[PDB]
Design an enzyme around this catalytic site. Structure first.
Site, PDB file in Angstrom:
ATOM      1  N   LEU A   1       0.829  -1.195   0.000  1.00  0.00           N
ATOM      2  CA  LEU A   1       0.000   0.000   0.000  1.00  0.00           C
ATOM      3  C   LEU A   1       0.868   1.252   0.000  1.00  0.00           C
ATOM      4  CD1 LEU A   1      -1.951  -2.278   1.350  1.00  0.00           C
ATOM      5  CD2 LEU A   1      -3.244  -0.297   2.139  1.00  0.00           C
ATOM      6  N   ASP A   2       0.240   2.375  -0.337  1.00  0.00           N
ATOM      7  CA  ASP A   2       0.918   3.658  -0.291  1.00  0.00           C
ATOM      8  C   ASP A   2       1.091   4.110   1.158  1.00  0.00           C
ATOM      9  OD1 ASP A   2       1.316   4.826  -3.144  1.00  0.00           O
ATOM     10  OD2 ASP A   2      -0.734   4.043  -3.194  1.00  0.00           O
TER      11      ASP A   2
END
Ligand code: PC7
Ligand code: 8Q1
Lengths: 615, 46, 76, 67, 47, 51, 243, 84, 109
Positions: free
Chosen positions: H40-41
């Site tokens: 994920l970011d």
């Protein structure tokens, strides 16, 4: 029979507080409710024996202060104005006690709450029935103290302590004003009793030497009484304690921050009707402040997003209209609004408290959404309350809320048009927020958390019967009382009120007023409802949430922070006095200059003078 | 300090509106004569 | 209240709920009635009511002072 | 039963008690002490004496010397 | 909707509908379904 | 009662919804009856036989 | 604070008011200014105090200074209220200092910040302290109100400026009295330096009972006290005042 | 005040990360970190924590809110609080 | 370079800024239906650049974002009632851990 009404709450609270261990957490509550209920029953008996059977009863227990013609006594005044206030205060107190048995059932400190409200009810009964200023001042300071105590019910709440202390501050400013007024009455009429000032209040026309110039006594006394009642009636001078005093329990905010103590100053100024009447200068400032507050509260209450805080501003607006109706020498209309309001405003708070109890105390309209069918009974209750708040046509709200504006127009002075303008304008804001409360809650797609939705738990039997009684009240009380309090010459105020022949705009108002003004409050209310519907259900992308940079978001902060007056007043008076209480005195006085050249600072030369005389 | 100007400005709106009521002169446009009552406008009653 | 069960708490502790409170409630009502009887007797003893009622009110069953103050010259 | 009386309190308590060692007749504080020591008593004295004088003027009686 | 976070919020709170309470617009005035009927019946009954 | 996908609400009580509906109906009836009787009085359509 | 502070006032009422009547009139404004500035300065000073004893010692100073305003206002109201407030203070200050003494004899702190939120632990002392600081407020129905309001009435018979400042004294007296009450008996407890501590035993719960009964007897029915003094006060005010 | 056990929490906590479609709702674990395993970011992680905040009514302080980048820490923190 | 300590404050600053901006826009958006597009635009705004490398284009950007956030505070943000700032924190708090109350005090000898 008549002595009982004021001492049943006091005795019941005394025994339930001294021996609260014996009666437990439920016996004390039920017995306090029983005592106040029989007090209300004897209040109804007294109402029948005094109001319909017009014969005021007067009884005197024993002199209080038997000094040189300062004969304040424990006598009681039971006139038509007294009984109509009693049948409100004790009835609402009994129903709130019934409401609080179930609402304050999970709380630990149940008996203390009951005893607090019962001593408070005793104090306000003493206030209402008081025959002279000192007894009235006794009840007034007692109810102020009890309001402070109930705000301080949860002592461990740091915010509640500060709120109660600030409420005591503003109440004490009111105490200053009213004490000076009361004593000023004695220096003129050599009495404090109601029946002597009223009998002889027109003879003197002299001017006093009151510490700055020469002022007329009657005008000065009325101004001082207004300065006393500004704190209690929540007027422009000091009314910042209502929204911040909602940190206390809901029932007391339901019982008292909406019904009688907020109108205690209204009842006080109505009781001394033939003293404000002889000072036309005073009535000007009464009307001015009434319009000022009715506009301030209505404007500040439109952007609030708190359940128990947004309605306090509505109560302040109602107080503004009550003060305005007092300043028009038509206190009968003012007390009519009082009795109409004490039903539906208390109903609105009780319904809100019932909702907040079931939703685990989530008083943020940003959260509650559409679950009206979950709570239909409370929805109907608060719908009746809000419709009476609007002044819905041919309901208990219309019989006063339209008549007050109609009387406002019919008087032609400089401040009359100003006050009429403010009263007409405040309708829009009042309707807007009273309908936004019903829109953002129970009429929009739901936003409340699942943990609160799953609880449900509709209001039980104990806190639903008082709601039913207040609902049936604020649907027929206005109609049943419109003829019998203001009937264009009714025999209901033989000694309670003095109506001046000159300032008597009642007969000419109903007939000389245009038909258009008699319907324009309805149009303003409908416009407010439509605006609320547009901004809360259809056009809410920009009318409800505006992403403006400057000059528009500061407007959002202006109404939300109440014109920043809660901050200006603090920093400019309370902060200043807190700083300068020590900064000047404790530094450059007391121990200090009186010490350095006093006992032992530098006058102790003898120690330096010891080794010079033995040479 | 910014909040202070709002109190002066807000009160300025009211006195400005109060000045408007002075300029409007609502008092002198009554559609009715002063009230008349029997017995010398209730002189013995007063 | 771990320690709060040790304080006397004149008006009642955190959550007291004594074993027998109904009997205490009943004796409390009896005591209130007994103590308010003399209050009623005193109230009926001192009440002027200068004006006669228009219709027979539930009063004048224990109050005997009615129309006794229409003689406002022999007043001390 | 005696309190712990942690060390970070008695120092400030004695500083409040022993403030007599911090006073050097600074000019701003000299004006501050002078105004509340003399002027306000003088202003209030004029207030009461003129209140008495105006009260006596209306009655017409000659003013008391009030030394 | 689209935007990589609006849809994320919508997906989890699809229970917000709960059809019985998705739109409480029929019950704005719950007693108007019977109140107006009673009023009109009395209006035509007394006459 | 029943759950949609993780939220369940107790069924509203019968003795609450019934009274709410009936009381709303009776206040609507009272409002409409008051409109029928003295409606023209407050709207200037006709005066209460006083002129 | 119960007797010694009465010597000056009683000495004024015995050997100063009668013997020098016109001197009293000539020195009247000066005493008014001194008493008013004393009230105001003491009220502003006492609201930033941390010593457990001085906090009410300054209240005693304020009350004693307010006494002289009506004591030197030659009037039956003023002098009568003077002695009534004097007795009322002799009771209430004594009660407050006994409360401070019992608080100090357990913990031995002589501070104000140490104590906090002890209502859950000493409820009886909490109620007694509330009643005493409630009487210090000058509630009607308590001892201080009748006398103090009589002083205000008597001074306002003579002058209209200074005793308005006296009344302004109580606009802050009540405020800091309840604020002081809320330092100690309110809030959450701090069991970091309040490990063990008890409530009043049989001695010091009974010792306040005479104070309570005398306070309420002052408050609700002060006629018996005013009855015995109206002859002496009226004789005092009229001495050397032939006309 | 039922003091729901961990087994009554391991489902609602996993519901939000299963409803997260940017990563497949098939390789999610009660013990997983969104920075490496699920990829994920650094910005969308707080979205799931906030979603939990609406899911379970509890205000997590701003100080340690961002330190919870593993699914184990969120359920542990909500369970550790007594009034959750 | 190659010191994550300097690159650290950027990451936590932007993440905390995202969290508080989401909270404040939830405060602004009473209705969740209109909150969806607002949140989408908010996350797009923080993803507009999403590619800064230089040390000159990091501090000014976050300072500008924080300053613009200072202009939007929503004076009344939502607070959980039992959270430190809500309507039910410290309402009926649990009694403290350990204290004892003695009984016999002020006796004779
Ligand atoms: C000049 C006075 C005029 C008369 C004024 C009377 C007004 C009442 C004065 C007392 C009010 C009560 C304030 C007491 C202190 C408040 C806090 C407190 O300590 O309460 C006590 C006692 O609570 C009470 O309030 C009982 C006192 C009596 C209250 C009712 C007063 C009724 C008599 C006064 C009025 C009589 C009528 C007028 C008389 C002529 C304990 O409360 P609990 O519920 O047990 O809490 C437990 C503590 N803990 C959690 C830590 C375990
Ligand atoms: C009324 C006031 C007017 C309106 C006010 C509106 C306020 C707008 C505020 C806007 C502030 C911004 O743009 S804040 C936007 C800041 N964006 C960045 O810093 C991008 C940095 N990217 C990286 O470091 C790496 O790609 C990576 C580690 C993968 C990403 O992880 P991080 O993300 O952790 O950094």
């Amino acid at each position: 029979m008549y002595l009982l009404i004021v001492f049943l709450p006091l005795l019941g609270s005394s025994v339930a507080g001294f021996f609260g261990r014996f009666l437990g957490s439920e016996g004390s509550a039920i017995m306090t409710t029983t005592c106040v209920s029989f007090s209300s029953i004897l209040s109804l008996i007294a109402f029948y024996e005094v109001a319909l059977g017009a014969s005021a009863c007067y009884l005197r227990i024993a002199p209080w202060i038997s000094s040189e013609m300062f004969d304040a006594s424990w006598g009681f005044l039971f006139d038509s104005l007294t009984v109509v206030m009693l049948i409100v205060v004790t009835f609402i107190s009994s129903l709130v006690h019934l409401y609080s048995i179930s609402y304050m059932s999970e709380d630990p400190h149940s008996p203390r709450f009951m005893c607090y409200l019962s001593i408070f009810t005793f104090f306000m009964l003493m206030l209402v029935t008081g025959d002279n200023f000192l007894q009235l001042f006794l009840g007034w300071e007692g109810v102020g103290l009890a309001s402070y105590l109930l705000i301080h019910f949860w002592f461990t709440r740091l915010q509640a302590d500060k709120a109660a202390i600030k409420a005591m501050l503003v109440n004490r400013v009111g105490d200053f004003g009213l004490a000076l007024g009361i004593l000023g009455c004695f220096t003129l009429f050599q009495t404090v009793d109601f029946s002597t000032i009223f009998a002889c209040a027109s003879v003197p026309r002299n001017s006093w030497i009151f510490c700055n110039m020469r002022l007329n006594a009657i005008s000065l006394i009325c101004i001082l009484l207004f300065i006393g009642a500004v704190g209690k009636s929540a007027q422009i001078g000091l009314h910042t304690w209502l929204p911040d005093a909602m940190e206390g329990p809901t029932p007391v905010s339901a019982l008292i921050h909406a019904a009688t103590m907020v109108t205690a100053g209204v009842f006080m100024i109505a009781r001394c009707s033939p003293l404000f009447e002889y000072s036309p200068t005073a009535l000007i400032v009464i009307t001015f402040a009434g319009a000022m507050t009715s506009f301030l509260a209505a404007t500040t209450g439109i952007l609030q997003n708190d359940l128990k805080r947004v309605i306090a501003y509505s109560t302040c607006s109602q107080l503004g209209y009550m003060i305005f109706a007092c300043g028009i020498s038509n206190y009968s209309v003012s007390v009519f609004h009082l009795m109409n309001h004490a039903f539906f405003k208390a109903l609105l708070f009780l319904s809100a408290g019932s909702v907040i109890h079931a939703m685990s105390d989530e008083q943020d309209m940003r959260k509650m959404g559409g679950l009206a069918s979950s709570f239909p009974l409370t929805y109907a209750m608060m719908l009746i309350g809000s419709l009476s708040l609007i002044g819905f046509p041919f309901l208990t709200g219309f019989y006063s809320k339209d008549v007050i504006l109609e009387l406002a127009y019919t008087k032609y002075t400089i401040s009359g048009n100003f006050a009429f303008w403010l009263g007409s304008v405040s309708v829009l804001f009042t309707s807007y927020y009273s309908f936004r409360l019903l829109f953002l809650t129970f009429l929009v797609p739901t936003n409340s958390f699942g943990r609160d939705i799953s609880r449900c738990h509709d209001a039980p039997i104990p806190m639903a019967i008082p709601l039913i009684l207040l609902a049936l009240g604020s649907l027929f009380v206005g109609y049943l009382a419109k003829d019998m309090m203001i009937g264009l010459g009714t025999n209901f105020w033989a000694n309670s009120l003095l109506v001046l022949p000159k300032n008597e705009i009642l007969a000419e108002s109903e007939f000389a007023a245009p038909t258009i003004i008699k319907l324009i409050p309805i149009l303003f209310s409908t416009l407010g409802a439509f605006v609320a519907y547009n901004v809360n259900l259809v056009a809410d992308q920009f009318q409800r949430a505006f992403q403006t940079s400057t000059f528009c978001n500061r407007l959002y902060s202006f109404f939300n922070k109440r014109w920043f007056f809660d901050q200006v007043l603090n920093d400019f008076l309370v902060r200043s006095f807190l700083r300068f209480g020590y900064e000047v005195s404790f530094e450059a006085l007391d121990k200090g200059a009186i010490e350095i050249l006093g006992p032992y600072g530098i006058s102790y030369t003898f120690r330096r003078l010891a080794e010079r005389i033995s040479q | 300090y910014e909040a202070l100007a709002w109190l002066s400005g807000g009160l300025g709106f009211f006195v400005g509106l109060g000045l408007l009521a002075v300029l409007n002169d609502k008092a002198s446009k009554v559609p009715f004569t002063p009230r008349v009552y029997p017995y010398d406008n209730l002189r013995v009653e007063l | 209240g771990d320690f709060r069960a040790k304080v006397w708490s004149m008006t009642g502790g955190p959550n007291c709920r004594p074993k027998h409170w109904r009997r205490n409630t009943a004796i409390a009502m009896f005591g209130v009635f007994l103590v308010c009887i003399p209050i009623a007797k005193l109230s009926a003893k001192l009440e002027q009511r200068p004006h006669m009622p228009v219709r027979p009110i539930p009063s004048q069953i224990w109050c005997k002072n009615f129309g006794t103050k229409d003689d406002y010259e022999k007043e001390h | 039963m005696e309190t712990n009386k942690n060390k970070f309190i008695e120092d400030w308590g004695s500083a409040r008690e022993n403030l007599e060692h911090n006073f050097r007749w600074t000019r701003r504080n000299f004006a501050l002490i002078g105004i509340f020591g003399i002027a306000l008593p003088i202003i209030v004295y004029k207030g009461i004496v003129k209140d008495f004088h105006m009260q006596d003027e209306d009655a017409g009686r000659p003013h008391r010397k009030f030394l | 909707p689209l935007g990589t976070t609006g849809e994320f919020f919508r997906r989890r709170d699809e229970w917000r509908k709960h059809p019985m309470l998705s739109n409480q617009m029929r019950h704005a005035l719950p007693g108007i379904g019977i109140g107006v009927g009673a009023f009109c019946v009395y209006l035509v009954g007394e006459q | 009662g029943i759950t949609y996908k993780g939220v369940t609400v107790h069924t509203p009580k019968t003795w609450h919804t019934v009274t709410g509906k009936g009381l709303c109906a009776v206040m609507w009836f009272w409002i409409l009856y008051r409109a029928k009787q003295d409606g023209p009085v407050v709207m200037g359509w006709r005066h209460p036989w006083d002129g | 604070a119960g007797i010694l502070l009465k010597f000056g006032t009683y000495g004024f009422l015995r050997f100063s008011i009668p013997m020098f009547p016109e001197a009293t009139l000539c020195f009247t404004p000066f005493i008014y200014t001194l008493s008013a500035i004393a009230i105001i300065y003491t009220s502003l000073t006492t609201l930033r105090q941390i010593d457990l004893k001085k906090i009410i010692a300054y209240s005693s100073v304020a009350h004693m200074n307010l006494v002289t305003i009506g004591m030197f206002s030659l009037n039956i109201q003023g002098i009568g209220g003077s002695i009534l407030l004097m007795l009322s203070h002799g009771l209430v200050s004594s009660a407050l200092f006994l409360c401070v003494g019992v608080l100090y004899d357990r913990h031995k702190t002589r501070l104000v910040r140490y104590y906090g939120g002890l209502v859950s632990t000493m409820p009886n002392f909490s109620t007694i302290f509330f009643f005493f600081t409630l009487a210090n407020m000058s509630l009607p129905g308590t001892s201080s109100f009748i006398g103090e309001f009589l002083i205000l009435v008597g001074a306002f018979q003579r002058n209209s400026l200074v005793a308005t400042l006296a009344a302004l004294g109580m606009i802050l007296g009540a405020a800091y009295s309840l604020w002081l009450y809320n330092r100690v008996v309110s809030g959450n407890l701090k069991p970091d330096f309040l490990h063990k501590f008890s409530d009043l035993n049989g001695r010091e719960v009974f010792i306040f009972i005479p104070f309570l009964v005398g306070l309420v007897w002052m408050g609700v029915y002060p006629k018996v006290f005013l009855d015995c003094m109206h002859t002496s006060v009226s004789n005092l005010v009229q001495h050397g005042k032939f006309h | 005040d039922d003091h729901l056990s961990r087994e009554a929490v391991v489902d609602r906590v996993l519901d939000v990360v299963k409803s997260f479609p940017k990563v497949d709702p098939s390789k999610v674990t009660p013990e997983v970190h969104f920075q490496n395993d699920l990829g994920l970011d650094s910005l969308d992680t707080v979205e799931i924590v906030m979603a939990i905040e609406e899911e379970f009514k509890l205000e997590i302080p701003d100080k340690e809110a961002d330190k919870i980048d593993s699914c184990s820490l969120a359920i542990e923190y909500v369970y550790n609080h007594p009034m959750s | 370079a190659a010191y994550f300590a300097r690159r650290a404050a950027q990451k936590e600053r932007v993440r905390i800024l995202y969290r508080r901006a989401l909270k404040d826009t939830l405060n602004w958006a009473v209705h969740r239906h209109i909150f969806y597009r607002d949140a989408s635009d908010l996350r797009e705004k923080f993803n507009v650049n999403q590619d800064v490398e230089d040390v000159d284009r990091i501090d000014k950007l976050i300072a500008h974002g924080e300053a613009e956030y200072n202009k939007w505070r929503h004076p009344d943000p939502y607070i959980v009632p039992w959270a430190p700032g809500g309507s039910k924190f410290c309402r009926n708090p649990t009694p403290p851990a350990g204290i004892e109350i003695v009984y016999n005090y002020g006796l004779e000898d």
